[PDB]
Amino acid sequence: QLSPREFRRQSLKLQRQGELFGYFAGLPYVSWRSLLRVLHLLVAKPFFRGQDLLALPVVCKRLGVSDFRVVDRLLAGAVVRPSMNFASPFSKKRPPFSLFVASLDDWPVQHHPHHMHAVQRLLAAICANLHNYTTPDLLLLFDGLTALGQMPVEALEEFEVTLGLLLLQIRARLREGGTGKDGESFFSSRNVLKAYEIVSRVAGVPPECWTSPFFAEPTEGQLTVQKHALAKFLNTSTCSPVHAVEDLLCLLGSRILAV
Amino acid sequence: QAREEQRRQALKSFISRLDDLFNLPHQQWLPLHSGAPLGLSPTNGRDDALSAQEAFLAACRLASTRGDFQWCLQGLNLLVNFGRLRPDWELSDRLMALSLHCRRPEQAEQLLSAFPHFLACPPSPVLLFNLIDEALAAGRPQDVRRIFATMREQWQLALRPAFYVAAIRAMLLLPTSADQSLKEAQLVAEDAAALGVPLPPVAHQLLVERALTLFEERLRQCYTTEELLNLAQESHNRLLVDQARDAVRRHRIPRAEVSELFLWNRAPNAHLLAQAAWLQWAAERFAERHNSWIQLLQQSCSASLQELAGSSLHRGLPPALLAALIRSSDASPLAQKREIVLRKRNVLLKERREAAQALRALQHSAFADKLPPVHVLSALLR
Amino acid sequence: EKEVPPPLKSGIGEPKKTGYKFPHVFFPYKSRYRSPHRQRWWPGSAPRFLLHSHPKRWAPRRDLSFAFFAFHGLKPFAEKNLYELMHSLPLRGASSFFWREADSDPWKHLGRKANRLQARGVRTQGRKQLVFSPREIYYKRRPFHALVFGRLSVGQLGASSRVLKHPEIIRGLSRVAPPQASLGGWKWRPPKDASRWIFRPKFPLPFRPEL
Amino acid sequence: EDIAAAFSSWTDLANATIDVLQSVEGMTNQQRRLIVKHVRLYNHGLWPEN
Amino acid sequence: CRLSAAQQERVLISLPQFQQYNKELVLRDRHLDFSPFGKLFNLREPACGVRTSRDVLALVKVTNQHVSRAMASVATLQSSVQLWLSENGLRNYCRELQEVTEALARSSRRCLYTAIVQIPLRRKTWVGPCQGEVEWATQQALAIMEADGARDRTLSKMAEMNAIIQCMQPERGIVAWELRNPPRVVTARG
RNA sequence: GGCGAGAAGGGAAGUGUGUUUCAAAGAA
RNA sequence: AUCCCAGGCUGA
RNA sequence: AAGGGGAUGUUUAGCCGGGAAAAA
């Protein structure tokens, strides 16, 4: 048990070591000074390691911190380079992304024209950073999003659109494939089987949003970032997400066919 | 009697004391709040005073009658006029609960329709559901339509498929013609689909059951037979799509091909297969009348057995389907022109054969326990 | 019977006032003195904001009900003010666009001074209006009192009544309290990038509105 | 309508004097001033294009 | 949860006495005993048992949902039976079934209403900031960050985070429609 | 919201009222 | 002393 | 309709200035 003043004094080292939210929870009382220090740290350095990543959404929900700006900063920090913060299914113990996404179930955002939950902001963040993700990062994010271990109806359509964009991007990257052959070699039988299992979750009964005009009345503000990502992908790189799913499944099945 | 008189006197005295204290200068008024830290030591001066809102709610605790509700309204009006009201979830929920407790459903509906003008937060969804339940209990399911419309239009009340299901069942329960009730339920379901709200399987199951029941009633001799069939097919397709969406959210040559599809299917659902078989039978019968489902029924029976060996949907075998099967199996032989009569007799014999096969499958099915032997036949004979 | 000023009353959200025993500071030795703070009660006048408008409302508990508290939000078009309009709108009216008409103000139609000589003559016979979009909202007395800020710009009305077309023809000020929000006839338009979740479409009407 | 009946033509109305306007039955001072102002405005082409 | 006659006489007889002792009518969890609630809910060991009026509320809510859904199922069953009649033991059973289900539903709804009305007001279980404090602190933190940035005017990840923030920001800007405090512009020395 | 508004005062005051002779600058 | 302020500033 | 009808939900704190009531 640390005094709140000393907790504020050492909060920087606590963050740098990953032992900040535990001390914060163990503090006797939380005053405006400690709250301000925590919020300033969150906004200035939205990067966290260890159990801090899992404690962050719970601590924010307990405190009531729901400002969409801070939520967006935290989610962007989390989703920037996920492979260095979250467990990578492909071959100390980084936590899985499924727990992190499930921890955002009841974390609302405030002061945003269209969004009311942190799930939508996370989806927007992944869509915005979509162009810079590598194949393992894309697969990790997809698996975390669609893992078995309740999203709101309002964000369901955005979630489906993000899944479609992720499928399209992984299809494009795999099709692009020296360095390509090195990546293929890194892709072993275990990784191919894991990718096949991951895609099998979405294999079957494609969402109607995929066939909707979005991937083909102005677009609503809900999917503005998704539209931006789709336009960027189209201009830099038409393949429907259903066709992308079929291509990925066929490629992985062919590789498997050749514990 | 004495206890009731004492509590009523307590309520009236509490209201009068609030009024007198308000009439007194403001420096003697009850504080708006209780104070915050820095302006047990940490707990000292956090909640140590009776706020005006707290006193109002404490007085409301003493109200249990439709007249006491008006004294509660007086307290609320005093708070509004003297500016000691800070609307919040507590105030909204407790006002709704006070109305319901005092048995003022009309006042509850008025609160639902009037809160956006003078209150910060809406009433609780549990209390909205209880209001719907009271409307159903009072023999006025139509009120559910208005209440649900107000909820959906209101932007602060989130959309929940449970409310859609309740509205659909109320529409089916309306004291009107079956066709009209089905049309109202269709309107509600179409609103849900247009907005993009995936409903639970039970609502679409109710819709398809109603449509097929009306279809069978029509074929025994508002919407036509084609309209009913199309409604049932669309509702079933919406059911499958909504089931897929919910799963994601929560994490002849075709006759032969049906066998391959079933063989390569992971684990179908008995009730869904039964409804699909009924739809296929209805489509085939209508096409023949204008001019196989047995496989689906057998697969449904097998799936029911598999489930017995090892979601939010209505479980059972449609009694309308059972009655149609029994009537088809009981096809009496008696029931250019001669050639047409021969063709009709052949079609009736085919239908009788299919009904007999379906009954044989259902006998071994897990649904046999739900059908008492020789009961539908006796009912028809009577 | 004689028409006289209505008795002074205190506004909603305030303690009572003791009052004064004579009308004004000169009574009765200067009968033609008029106080600047005198209540405007004669026809064709708008009562002062937060001084004589929104008086404390009292009714016998027999007639009290929940609808009694929606009076300010149900005030008619000519009387309802910007805050009362905004309170019961999606996101408290924020992100939308608002503009005032002024063609139905009480003075332009009623009173002894309604018809008077004008510098241009009498009326015989598309428009560029002022558009306000709220961004920061905070109600001090719901629904009729709030401290709002937002973007003020020059819009472009047109033939439908009139409908806003280009709310941002010219950029004005990015953060200012609404103009003439105290009272008047306000009209609003939701944003182009509207979400069906927030701006709920009208629920379908019953096919057979049985009695 | 009575004022129009009194004034037989637009020329008479435009060139009428304040004495004639006062002589007109039923015309008040405010009506006379309004008529004078609008007649002058029209003769000067500032009305009805006001 | 209700007031006793002792309090009704001590603090509700007259205005001076009410003003003398009005702080006594602050119903908090410390003034309630949950042993009878636990006994009525059973919750025999190793079950947790009732510890707060909010737990009482949650249990009543669960019971109410179960009873209400049972009532809805019975209602739709009776509707189907009425349809069949339009096309006996069925209605003979349904009369009693509906009667019992309706009585149970009324009891559950009344229990929920009484719980909501009577349960004491909800206060933070610990010593933490309020909504106004949270709002001001967030605004102050953002202002301090902006001031430090203006003062300035492994970091590749920070640059990427800034880029994603810019690409994710809504075009129109922040829309604060439920501010806890009157609008304010917070600043910092940087 | 902004300007103007004394039914145009004879209700006080004798060494007073008023009269006569003077004087009065911001941007220092 | 906390009723109002279309009056302001501050809190690392 | 076993399972979201779930869960989270104390009040921003000071200083100056101006106004009203009570008191003086």
Numbering used by the authors:
A (entry chain Yk): 208 to 298, 339 to 396, 417 to 444, 449 to 487, 510 to 530, 546 to 566, 585
B (entry chain BC): 144 to 182, 230 to 411, 447 to 476, 497 to 536, 573 to 591, 597 to 621, 630 to 676
C (entry chain Bt): 11 to 135, 174 to 208, 239 to 289
D (entry chain By): 75 to 124
E (entry chain Yk): 1167 to 1253, 1302 to 1367, 1426 to 1462
Q: What do the paper's sentences say?
A:
Mitochondrial ribosomes (mitoribosomes) play the central and ubiquitous role of synthesising mitochondrial proteins which are essential for the survival of almost all eukaryotes including parasites. In contrast, the mitoribosome of the apicomplexan parasite Toxoplasma gondii assembles from over 50 extremely short rRNA molecules. We resolved the complete mitoribosome structure with map resolutions of the large and small ribosomal subunits (LSU and SSU) ranging from 2.2 to 2.8 Å. The result of these analyses reveals a total of 53 rRNA molecules, markedly exceeding the previously predicted level of fragmentation.
The 32 LSU and 21 SSU rRNA molecules are extremely short, ranging from 278 to just seven nucleotides. The structure consists of a total of 124 modelled proteins, as well as a Zn2+, a Mg2+ and an ATP, molecules in the SSU and a Zn2+ and two Fe2S2 in the LSU. The remodelling include reduction and fragmentation of the critical contact mediator rRNA helix 44 (h44). While the remaining fragments of h44 are scaffolded by helical repeat proteins, they do not directly contribute to subunit interactions. Subunit association is instead mediated via rRNA through an SSU expansion segment h31-ES1, and via a protein heterodimer with transcriptional-activator-PC4-like (PC4) domains, mS135 and mS136 (one of two heterodimers seen in this mitoribosome). The PC4-like heterodimer is positioned on the top of the SSU head, poised for interactions with the CP, and associates tightly with a strand of nucleic acid. This strand does not coincide with any known rRNA structure, nor does it appear to be an expansion segment, and is therefore unlikely to be rRNA. Of the four highly conserved proteins that bind along the canonical mRNA channel found in mitoribosomes of other lineages, only uS5m is present in the T. gondii mitoribosome. Two proteins are lost (uS4m and uS7m), and one (uS3m) is heavily reduced, retaining only a small fragment corresponding to the ciliate mS92. The missing uS3m binding site is occupied by several terminal extensions from surrounding proteins without detectable sequence similarities or structural convergences (uS14m, mS92 and mS134), while uS7m is replaced by a tandem ApiAP2-domain containing protein, mS130.
